[PDB]
Design a protein around this ligand. Sequence first.
Ligand SMILES: Cc1cc2c(cc1C)N(C[C@H](O)[C@H](O)[C@H](O)COP(=O)(O)O)c1[nH]c(=O)[nH]c(=O)c1N2
Ligand SMILES: Cc1cc2c(cc1C)N(C[C@H](O)[C@H](O)[C@H](O)COP(=O)(O)O)c1[nH]c(=O)[nH]c(=O)c1N2
Ligand SMILES: Cc1cc2c(cc1C)N(C[C@H](O)[C@H](O)[C@H](O)COP(=O)(O)O)c1[nH]c(=O)[nH]c(=O)c1N2
Ligand SMILES: Cc1cc2c(cc1C)N(C[C@H](O)[C@H](O)[C@H](O)COP(=O)(O)O)c1[nH]c(=O)[nH]c(=O)c1N2
Lengths: 364, 364, 364, 364
Amino acid sequence: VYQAGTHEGMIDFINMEDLELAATQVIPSGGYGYISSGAGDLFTYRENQKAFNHQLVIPHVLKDVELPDTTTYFSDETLAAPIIMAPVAAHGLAHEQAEKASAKGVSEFGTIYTASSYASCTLEEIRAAGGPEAPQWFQFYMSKDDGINLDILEMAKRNGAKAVVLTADATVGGNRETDRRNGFTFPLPMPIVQAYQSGVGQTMDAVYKSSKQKLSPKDIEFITTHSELPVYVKGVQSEDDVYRSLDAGAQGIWVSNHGGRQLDGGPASFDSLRYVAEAVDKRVPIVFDSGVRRGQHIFKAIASGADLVAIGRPAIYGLSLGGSTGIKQVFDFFKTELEMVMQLAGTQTVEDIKNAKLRENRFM
Amino acid sequence: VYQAGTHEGMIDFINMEDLELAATQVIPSGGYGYISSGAGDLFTYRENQKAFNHQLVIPHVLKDVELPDTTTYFSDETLAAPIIMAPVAAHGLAHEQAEKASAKGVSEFGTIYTASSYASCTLEEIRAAGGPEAPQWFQFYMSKDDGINLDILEMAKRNGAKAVVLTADATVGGNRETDRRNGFTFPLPMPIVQAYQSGVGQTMDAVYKSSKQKLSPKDIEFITTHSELPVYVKGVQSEDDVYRSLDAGAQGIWVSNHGGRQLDGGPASFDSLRYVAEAVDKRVPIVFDSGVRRGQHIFKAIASGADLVAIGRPAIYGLSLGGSTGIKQVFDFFKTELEMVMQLAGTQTVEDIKNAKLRENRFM
Amino acid sequence: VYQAGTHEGMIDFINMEDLELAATQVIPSGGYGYISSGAGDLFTYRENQKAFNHQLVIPHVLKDVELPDTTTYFSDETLAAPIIMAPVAAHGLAHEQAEKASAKGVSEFGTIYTASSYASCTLEEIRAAGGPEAPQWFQFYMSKDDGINLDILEMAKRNGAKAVVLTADATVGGNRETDRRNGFTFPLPMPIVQAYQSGVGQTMDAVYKSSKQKLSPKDIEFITTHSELPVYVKGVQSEDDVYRSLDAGAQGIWVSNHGGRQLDGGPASFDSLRYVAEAVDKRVPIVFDSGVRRGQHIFKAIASGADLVAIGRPAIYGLSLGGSTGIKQVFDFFKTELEMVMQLAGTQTVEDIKNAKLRENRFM
Amino acid sequence: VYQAGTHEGMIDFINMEDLELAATQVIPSGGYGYISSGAGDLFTYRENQKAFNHQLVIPHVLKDVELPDTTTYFSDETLAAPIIMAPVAAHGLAHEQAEKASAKGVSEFGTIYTASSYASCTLEEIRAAGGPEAPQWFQFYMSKDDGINLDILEMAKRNGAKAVVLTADATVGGNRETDRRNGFTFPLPMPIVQAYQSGVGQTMDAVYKSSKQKLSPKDIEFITTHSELPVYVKGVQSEDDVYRSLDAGAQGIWVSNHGGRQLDGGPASFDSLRYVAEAVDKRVPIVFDSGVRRGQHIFKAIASGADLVAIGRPAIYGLSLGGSTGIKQVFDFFKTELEMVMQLAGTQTVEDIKNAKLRENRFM
Ligand SMILES: Cc1cc2c(cc1C)N(C[C@H](O)[C@H](O)[C@H](O)COP(=O)(O)O)c1[nH]c(=O)[nH]c(=O)c1N2
Ligand SMILES: Cc1cc2c(cc1C)N(C[C@H](O)[C@H](O)[C@H](O)COP(=O)(O)O)c1[nH]c(=O)[nH]c(=O)c1N2
Ligand SMILES: Cc1cc2c(cc1C)N(C[C@H](O)[C@H](O)[C@H](O)COP(=O)(O)O)c1[nH]c(=O)[nH]c(=O)c1N2
Ligand SMILES: Cc1cc2c(cc1C)N(C[C@H](O)[C@H](O)[C@H](O)COP(=O)(O)O)c1[nH]c(=O)[nH]c(=O)c1N2
């Protein structure tokens, strides 16, 4: 039997590194390997966190700032901070209460929750746990069957999704050698995609291969036609990918390399953000993720063209140790660090962060 | 008595690093040192594998790709993948069945086998083991005696060689200090070059010095005159070397630094490929080798101007552990990784890989 | 009870690294952690010392130099060397005699002493210990209350401060995780700021938050209006910060990142010095600090536009082990190294150092 | 009593790294520390050997080369190879037979021997040991007394010195902290400089301070006036130093940073060679040293503008273990490696090395 974390309450940590280590005590070895590792030789995975010091934040002085405000106005939403929950599969790997605990905690922090197509819970349970005023987005792993795709989009609409995130950088799984060494298989169902994927006893490789490989601009047009919700393309790391996405009617761009879990030997996401921000030229919102472990990383991403920054692994480690309380403590850690960075950089508001100029590191 | 690997069947490995370590259990210490190490302080040897992350592969999205096809049309050949066997001396160091096992396995995978002048078997045995439809090339370590050179070329013709690979970067042996520490000598004859070299009990240094040092463009003209087979020059790493080769009538260029076994303090082969591809300007085919351990390395070489990528040490480690089955499993490992990279990069066919644009890594 | 160093006399050390290690034997663990560590992941802290080899000193020959002279004419002062004491809080953490021992030792060496607002002693005790001819500057952590600010400035005037150093890069404390792990609190009062801060049992974070966060150019104008002393802005690392400071009437610029204790992910101070020196264009004096551990670091800073270089941690380690004798030995170590560097670089006087041209390191 | 090496005969080594380690068995700890270490934090010392891979040697093919010839015509001399003995103090630290053993071995190899002013033997003994046809140069540490300087120059003339090497980069000693830790003092006299320096029981720092600090172009004119021998300036690493030297009548330039023993935080000598070669523009010969441990290092220096390359520490380690036989084996190691590099680079003669083009390493 697979037994995940069961604690609901305050957790003890200093930073995201000791939090990651502490989670090894409550997540079964195979599940921990699935969450913690990445593709191939882990070049791209390691580069994600290193890349934030490719650009240096200037601690400006005499900027007439106190009590910096992380409050973020995004569409008709008011967020506590420009920090959201990334779509992460199978929260039941981390905590018994799974996406019910994560959706409740992110709702209570007061920011956007992105639900995974590969969730351990139904979208109905995710909406119920967050409450009716919780801002929730739906991340779509599409079927090869358009009937099933219409059914999943109608289901996202019923549950009040405010955007559809088409993940386009996992048409097949990466060469995740920790999963291979562990003989990893999923312990729980995936109810949202149950029409094409059963989850239980399936390999990582098998699950991605059950979804659609031949994604194209026609898939954005399909989602627009049948849902009327704004479409974000996730995995965008170049100008060519921006123009393909916007020409097909995308209303958002999500810069990511899937936390270094996919194509080893590719760039760090933070380096790609510069190319993507130039191509987008503020025409649509940008979400950024992959390697974020400090407030200074969030500041640098927003200064470089991100409107929102998404959190993956650190939120899952917090969930494993403390449930809803634990995941909210991780968002609070990032908000508290961002407030410190805003004061020392001289930015009163999130819009002021966007206008900050970083210095390129010539000696990395 | 020298006792190499004897197993014929499926081998257990994750990647080429644990395969290299596993081979230490079946290859005698001196033979393992000869295969595994390189020249001088090993700067050039280490740089070969590191250099693939000097250029970054973009994981494009919405590229309308599924079931990527590695099938490669090269001259009148149909190859399983754009991946061939490099010429490697003395396979009897690795497996009792030597080049009979390696030629059979590479034939069954369905790609080009390059036979070494310093083989443990005759070219007749190599042709017999591969079968009459197996695509085979002949790698030439020339004699100082032109009579012997005519005899060896007529022998290559009789055995249906489709190209002659003139190896030009080993006129003398490098300073291979592992061979010195081990007191390495060859345990087996070298029948192809028996007219000038006996093999048994000879040092690495002695064998290279028995071949021709004063290679020049006149040697390409000699091979053309007497064989009528296309000549590839192997070891080409600069524009000057391309023009010398093509002006003398070469019909192919093989970019290599001999797996870091020759001139320590020289460039990584993958970095040299850019200079060579610019000079060749698609006038003749390019083969690339040295440091290839992943599908992403093959993808990057082809995107950078290679038509074919050759495998050395990893194929020999597979041979040592599993014979024909083992060497085919190594080619299958590279083909399976290349299919994963093609799907995540957005390339349907090998010609699409050639049109991919890599991003230079400004933070190596 | 908190028990610091008590020795007054000569100490045994080779360089500042073994001095830092030796101090662990006499400074209580919590105090040692407070002095020795820095912010976040310590990127900026480590980069400070590494950055001095971003620029290379040319050992010129035949320069007609002997007995190089470090004597420095600064305003109406004659200093032994262009090397001064940085403002460092709470010397009682290091030695029982606290700022009485440090002010006496720096006076006897013959250079500027910068008194911290967060001193363990009164400014009256600091002036008494240095003697009436000792050059002393006052470092200001401002109150939120302008009445208290007028009182502190009148107090600096009474004690013969020759400049006011407005520290502007610590409006809040950095994420100093060693202090968090140690549960660090200050053991002694802070008499200079007693009107707003009691010191005893207070966290690092609490003390900075008791001072003024909303520093602006109006604060320079306030100090000028009420003290008539030259104002230096400390923490300046960019052109924008120079122009803000000078436009508000600053008569000096102090380039610093607070010894890597504040905004992790910011530049090394030595790299920032180039940008600041270009903007200042010799209009006002420049003080430089953060990471100085060798004479070559002082030489490089002065060649790059610094008029004076300030010493922090190394002076405190010397104080802990030897009191007034020990801190003077640290200044003597830096002066002796600077004399060696001046002879080998070919600079007879400090003005000659300013005219030296460094070579940028293209291979860091 | 100080007891150095006593063996005369063949020594067992692979490369200069295991030779350096083996010498620890025969050189007393204090002497070994004096020979093996360098200044300050050893940045410049470590950079010397690393810097050779800042520029990459192209292994050219089809260059029509065999039996490469290292024979070097320099002035009226015929050298075995473009490889000479650097001036190194006090060979009695390494071997009982001191400079008698080193001069005999270098004479028998057939190249230039540079005698140190701080030799353990007289120049008469050095000339007698080398024989009358041995090419010998005299390295000058000048006195503050011009009478003593005239006496030393007349002595160099009597002993048939063919050049005077004015060492200009050691006007004072570097901060050699191994010597400090060891309490190092010289065990033997320095007969050449006995008029101003006794040697026995003296520190490194004291010996350099007894020589002339205020070296200037007037000192080149003095040597020319009183000896009529060509003057080389040693320690030249910039254009300014070339023009100062040539304007004063120098007939040679010796590029060096004194093996990283002097100004820590300065450039690697191999990097400085490019700047010096451009300024000299073949107007006078260039000697190069500091960090040479391989044939590829000698090749790269000559391709970059050096006419001769000098050997320091490796020659002293060979001397300690094998006397005249041992030091000749070290020169033979370098000649044998240079022959291998010349064959693989495609250079028939030393003049061909000068015309080789290196590729700058963009990924160091
Ligand atoms: C365990 C786990 C599982 C998933 C993911 C990640 C991880 C760690 N990610 C990728 C995710 O959205 C995000 O891009 C990364 O997690 C960001 O990198 P960091 O984890 O913050 O370093 C992911 N993305 C997505 O679109 N759908 C999914 O179902 C998942 N599943
Ligand atoms: C044990 C061994 C033996 C040989 C070689 C290599 C090795 C490892 N190589 C060089 C070979 O063709 C190829 O360039 C390298 O092996 C490529 O580097 P990797 O081994 O893939 O890293 C080689 N090349 C050649 O032209 N003729 C030969 O006989 C040999 N022999
Ligand atoms: C223990 C301690 C305490 C303080 C400081 C530093 C340290 C180490 N610093 C910063 C100081 O002035 C200086 O910028 C740095 O010390 C310089 O870096 P190094 O210590 O030389 O590496 C500091 N600066 C300031 O303006 N007022 C203060 O009260 C203090 N307090
Ligand atoms: C033990 C020892 C002693 C000396 C030296 C070096 C060493 C190691 N060197 C410097 C020498 O000429 C040369 O520049 C360096 O040795 C070159 O660096 P490598 O030793 O080859 O790395 C030196 N130079 C000089 O001009 N006169 C001298 O008396 C000495 N003495």
